Amino acid sequence: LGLGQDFRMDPAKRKVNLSIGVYRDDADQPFVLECVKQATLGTNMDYAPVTGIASFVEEAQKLCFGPTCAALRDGRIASCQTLGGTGALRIGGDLLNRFVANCNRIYGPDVGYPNHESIFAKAGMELTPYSYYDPATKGLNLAGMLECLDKAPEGSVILVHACAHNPTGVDPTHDDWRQVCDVIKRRNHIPFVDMAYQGFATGQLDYDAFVPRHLVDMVPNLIVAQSFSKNFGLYGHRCGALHISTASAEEAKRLVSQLALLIRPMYNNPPLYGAWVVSSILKDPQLTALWKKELKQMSSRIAEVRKRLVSELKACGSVHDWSHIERQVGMMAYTGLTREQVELLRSEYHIYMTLNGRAAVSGLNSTNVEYVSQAIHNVTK
Amino acid sequence: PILGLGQDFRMDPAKRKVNLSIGVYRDDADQPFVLECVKQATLGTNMDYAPVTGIASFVEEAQKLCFGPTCAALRDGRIASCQTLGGTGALRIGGDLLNRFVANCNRIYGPDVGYPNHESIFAKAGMELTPYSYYDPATKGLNLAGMLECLDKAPEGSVILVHACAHNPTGVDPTHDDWRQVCDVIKRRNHIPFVDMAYQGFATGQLDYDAFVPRHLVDMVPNLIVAQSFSKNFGLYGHRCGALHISTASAEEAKRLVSQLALLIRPMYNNPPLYGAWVVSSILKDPQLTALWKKELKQMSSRIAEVRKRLVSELKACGSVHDWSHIERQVGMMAYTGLTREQVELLRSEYHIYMTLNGRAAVSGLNSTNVEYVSQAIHNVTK
Ligand SMILES: [Cl-]
Ligand SMILES: [Cl-]
Ligand SMILES: [Cl-]
Ligand SMILES: [Cl-]
Ligand SMILES: [Cl-]
């Protein structure tokens, strides 16, 4: 928030904000999807049910798990609408801490999403790290991850990013996830999937939901926190869903009613607007096909600008390796710049990143990529 | 369980059925009512996240609407405020904040007959809801002397929850004279008032009068909490729009609390929904929309008070010899009818009129089309 306010107050004409949390188009503008503009809104403003607009919840389920999913056919998954991904993470955590014995710890990647620590602390669970990011390669440390998961106490809650890891952009492959998931099954761990970027990551909805789809048949309980903030661009409308797989329809009904008991004394019932939009889009074959193509356009721009930054760096004469910038996936990139280097980019060039070298690559575009590349070279050469 | 009453009502095949358990306003033709001022409000151009504490312009207008145009506390910057998920979110976030400024914060006092969700809201924030005397079932009216005595004997520095107006579920409100006495006790005993104001303007059609309680208390005590809902008064229900206000001694004190509010909001839901904030901000900043809104408020509040008054006259015209003056003395959408459990059940079984077993009637479900029938049925089961 401080980097935002400083950027805003900075008088320089050439300034660039690479600390934002939101997608931007090539003209650095906010981007309301056409499928969203074309969506049909509700006719009244009556409160939705505590657990959300039923049609929205059902489409969220199908989008997450696929329309063929056995768990979903059998009614084994307990679901509700939530205040973005954040609300799902919180409600999920509050549910675990009430109902899992000695659920006072949750394991997440060593470099991870800032709000997770406080979300789970409010739920009475201490975020503990497992090995994940390798700063030498700005890449993955699988062996370290597998080992930490294998040695975590049986029945540990394991938090994983489904794709487009935030803030590094470092994702395991599907092959890697197969190994990770086997360890989770064998150690009877409870996987908690934060899926904030389905489809936004690679432009492929199915591929991007591999983690929860693969885990759902492997473990007794899978938790998924699903955000529609980025992939429908619905940020400030606060729209997401929480999913918890269970053994049976009857068990799922009992969990939903326990979800209601957490939701009611928090905010009573959830905001309509985002639920309308997502429900309307996913039930309309024209809006759904448009949405899919818009997702690909967002995801392709991000991957193309990453690839452009790398090629511009080479054209500027950089002799350092930037291949991590193209291997990483999604909106957030751990650049591998040092604190000193980040500070000089700010001071001399008015390019704003976090001090850990995270760059929101959505803030790069046709208009500024060349300049940012030159500056990055100048400060690393 | 309004939800069960809803589902049964829907599934009931009878030709003549009436739902008096609803939580929302309806017009005379039993339709949901989106205010014209709301339909005419200017919405934002993008969907980016609002700030954790809400759209600044919204929060400032919410403050002025609550406390008025000549509030010194507001001029001096002593009030810490944020946008919330309806009145519910303000109650929860407020409660979760109390231990920043209230000592030994494990209990909160509320009226003996009160808003159902309060118990659970404050239990989640670590506080046990304890009753003070308020509703008199003999008169379906107020028991002031019992309220004053409970407040006087509550331990010093107790948190006291009060409904600003249109008490839910009974419709029994103290007068301003009564509130003066209540507020003196709260000041003298160093109690901390927590005002749930869900019906400002919706209650009587007068925004200033309806906000008397928080306006009167704000100069009398070191800390006042207000949970403000825009669900009923702007008809914004399912958009989840409200604000939370906490008075303090100084701007510096307020700044600290706002930043602590942020720390509660972020790990709960990150930041609040735009739509309702846009609407309320746009209306309150436009003199033309504000005037329209004020008129529409009066229309809503007049219909509720006229249908109460009609039920009473129809009861008399049916031949009822019982007293129903409480129905007209009560204020707002909810009325404790004084019907017994047995009587509520017979209305349901014999007449297909649905209310909660406590005799609460959502009067907004009464209109030109059904008031006569409901009156006859109420007479038949009470005579
Ligand atoms: Cl695969
Ligand atoms: Cl480009
Ligand atoms: Cl009306
Ligand atoms: Cl007065
Ligand atoms: Cl009438």
XYZ file of N, CA and C in Angstrom, chain A residues 22 24 30 32 36 43-47 83 86-87 90 98 113 115 118-119 122 229-230 233-238 262 264-273 276, chain B residues 24 26 32 34 38 45-49 85 88-89 92 115 117 120-121 124 231-232 235-240 263-264 266-275 278:
240
model
N -3.010 -6.170 -9.171
C -4.079 -6.354 -10.164
C -3.596 -6.407 -11.628
N -3.507 -5.472 -15.542
C -3.633 -4.301 -16.380
C -3.517 -4.735 -17.832
N -7.082 -0.600 -16.066
C -7.899 -1.701 -15.527
C -8.733 -2.346 -16.648
N -11.977 -4.676 -17.440
C -13.242 -5.325 -17.179
C -13.491 -6.198 -18.388
N -17.941 -10.202 -18.677
C -18.474 -9.606 -17.454
C -19.420 -8.454 -17.790
N -32.322 -9.246 -10.620
C -33.353 -8.249 -10.717
C -33.654 -7.571 -9.367
N -33.363 -8.255 -8.269
C -33.586 -7.672 -6.950
C -32.297 -7.697 -6.112
N -32.364 -7.108 -4.934
C -31.228 -6.959 -4.044
C -31.412 -7.709 -2.734
N -32.416 -8.594 -2.658
C -32.627 -9.432 -1.490
C -31.341 -10.168 -1.114
N -31.215 -10.455 0.171
C -30.061 -11.178 0.679
C -29.982 -12.497 -0.031
N -16.093 -14.384 0.461
C -15.606 -13.045 0.149
C -14.230 -13.182 -0.494
N -9.814 -14.916 -0.177
C -9.464 -14.617 1.189
C -10.475 -15.214 2.153
N -11.758 -14.977 1.901
C -12.814 -15.475 2.778
C -12.853 -16.984 2.867
N -10.012 -18.069 5.159
C -10.317 -17.803 6.540
C -11.358 -18.784 7.058
N -11.720 -25.619 14.571
C -12.820 -26.147 15.369
C -12.850 -27.676 15.392
N 2.420 -16.232 0.008
C 1.446 -15.156 -0.071
C 1.348 -14.488 1.305
N -0.652 -12.475 3.103
C -1.860 -12.521 3.940
C -2.124 -13.910 4.561
N -1.428 -14.177 8.535
C -2.404 -13.533 9.386
C -3.769 -14.203 9.269
N -4.178 -14.598 8.055
C -5.437 -15.332 7.893
C -5.463 -16.555 8.823
N -5.428 -15.825 12.690
C -6.770 -15.516 13.202
C -7.602 -16.787 13.439
N -11.417 -13.294 -8.305
C -10.923 -11.924 -8.368
C -10.082 -11.616 -9.591
N -9.199 -12.534 -9.973
C -8.282 -12.299 -11.096
C -8.824 -12.852 -12.385
N -11.671 -10.934 -13.311
C -11.421 -9.515 -13.022
C -12.393 -8.877 -12.009
N -12.940 -9.686 -11.113
C -13.999 -9.232 -10.203
C -13.466 -8.725 -8.838
N -12.140 -8.559 -8.726
C -11.459 -8.013 -7.544
C -12.369 -7.467 -6.433
N -12.809 -6.228 -6.605
C -13.499 -5.494 -5.550
C -14.942 -5.893 -5.334
N -15.461 -6.776 -6.166
C -16.784 -7.362 -5.873
C -16.746 -8.540 -4.924
N -15.544 -9.003 -4.574
C -15.319 -9.970 -3.505
C -16.082 -11.257 -3.710
N -20.198 -20.463 10.795
C -19.036 -19.577 10.747
C -19.364 -18.273 9.975
N -22.404 -16.731 9.398
C -23.456 -15.860 9.894
C -22.939 -14.768 10.834
N -22.161 -15.156 11.879
C -21.607 -14.183 12.786
C -20.394 -13.424 12.237
N -20.011 -13.667 10.997
C -18.955 -12.886 10.328
C -19.553 -11.751 9.460
N -20.465 -12.107 8.567
C -21.101 -11.127 7.678
C -22.517 -11.515 7.257
N -23.091 -12.552 7.866
C -24.496 -12.941 7.667
C -24.699 -13.668 6.330
N -24.470 -12.952 5.237
C -24.627 -13.511 3.915
C -23.786 -12.710 2.888
N -23.411 -13.328 1.754
C -22.360 -12.757 0.921
C -22.892 -11.853 -0.195
N -22.013 -11.014 -0.781
C -22.430 -10.016 -1.761
C -22.847 -10.625 -3.102
N -23.999 -10.173 -3.600
C -24.632 -10.717 -4.803
C -23.860 -10.551 -6.109
N -23.287 -9.363 -6.284
C -22.933 -8.862 -7.594
C -22.038 -9.821 -8.353
N -23.785 -13.215 -9.234
C -24.575 -13.052 -10.446
C -23.730 -13.223 -11.666
N -37.061 -8.605 4.956
C -36.852 -7.530 3.992
C -38.125 -6.713 3.741
N -40.978 -4.868 1.637
C -41.776 -5.102 0.428
C -42.670 -3.896 0.221
N -40.242 -6.762 -4.103
C -39.005 -6.130 -3.648
C -38.947 -4.708 -4.201
N -36.375 -1.682 -5.154
C -35.116 -1.017 -5.454
C -35.397 0.468 -5.579
N -31.246 4.804 -5.925
C -30.254 3.754 -6.122
C -30.110 3.420 -7.585
N -16.048 3.106 -12.482
C -15.636 2.764 -13.842
C -14.873 1.433 -13.871
N -14.234 1.061 -12.769
C -13.449 -0.181 -12.737
C -13.823 -1.067 -11.549
N -13.199 -2.230 -11.489
C -13.473 -3.226 -10.465
C -12.286 -3.509 -9.577
N -11.267 -2.662 -9.593
C -10.103 -2.836 -8.686
C -10.563 -2.914 -7.230
N -9.740 -3.539 -6.396
C -10.050 -3.622 -4.966
C -10.208 -2.235 -4.402
N -19.182 -5.192 5.897
C -20.115 -6.073 5.274
C -21.493 -5.968 5.977
N -23.919 -6.303 10.011
C -23.378 -7.518 10.595
C -21.867 -7.417 10.720
N -21.214 -7.006 9.640
C -19.751 -6.901 9.647
C -19.257 -5.868 10.653
N -19.405 -7.448 14.098
C -18.336 -8.422 14.281
C -16.984 -7.743 14.412
N -31.953 -9.013 18.915
C -31.607 -9.461 17.585
C -30.867 -10.802 17.710
N -28.842 -12.768 15.864
C -27.423 -12.953 15.473
C -26.435 -12.286 16.460
N -24.233 -14.832 18.742
C -23.179 -15.534 18.059
C -22.105 -14.569 17.586
N -22.494 -13.403 17.063
C -21.519 -12.390 16.632
C -20.531 -12.075 17.775
N -18.243 -15.060 18.976
C -17.058 -15.203 18.121
C -15.946 -14.176 18.456
N -28.409 -1.692 4.616
C -29.217 -2.749 4.018
C -30.692 -2.413 3.834
N -31.291 -1.779 4.848
C -32.724 -1.489 4.813
C -32.977 -0.114 4.286
N -32.160 -0.008 0.792
C -32.550 -1.256 0.159
C -31.381 -2.045 -0.438
N -30.193 -1.918 0.139
C -29.002 -2.555 -0.425
C -28.698 -3.973 0.117
N -29.603 -4.523 0.937
C -29.510 -5.881 1.521
C -28.326 -6.727 1.062
N -28.497 -7.398 -0.066
C -27.552 -8.406 -0.507
C -26.275 -7.868 -1.130
N -26.171 -6.556 -1.294
C -24.873 -5.975 -1.621
C -23.915 -5.801 -0.462
N -24.400 -6.019 0.759
C -23.601 -6.060 1.971
C -22.820 -4.784 2.224
N -6.142 -4.459 10.339
C -5.563 -5.725 10.764
C -6.624 -6.813 11.058
N -7.831 -6.406 11.389
C -8.931 -7.337 11.540
C -9.558 -7.657 10.195
N -8.246 -7.448 6.997
C -7.444 -8.077 5.968
C -7.502 -9.599 5.997
N -7.227 -10.202 7.163
C -7.286 -11.659 7.281
C -8.692 -12.249 7.409
N -9.735 -11.419 7.350
C -11.105 -11.930 7.285
C -11.634 -11.974 5.841
N -11.505 -10.865 5.128
C -11.997 -10.768 3.745
C -11.203 -9.811 2.865
N -10.065 -9.304 3.346
C -9.134 -8.487 2.530
C -9.612 -7.059 2.361
N -10.729 -6.897 1.669
C -11.280 -5.586 1.402
C -12.751 -5.724 0.994
N -13.555 -4.651 1.111
C -14.995 -4.800 1.056
C -15.581 -4.607 -0.351
N -16.811 -5.062 -0.560
C -17.455 -4.963 -1.899
C -17.809 -3.530 -2.321
N -17.434 -3.176 -3.538
C -17.570 -1.827 -4.087
C -19.018 -1.305 -4.219
N -19.911 -2.182 -4.697
C -21.157 -1.757 -5.332
C -21.937 -0.846 -4.410
N -20.286 2.611 -3.755
C -20.529 3.504 -4.876
C -21.880 4.151 -4.731
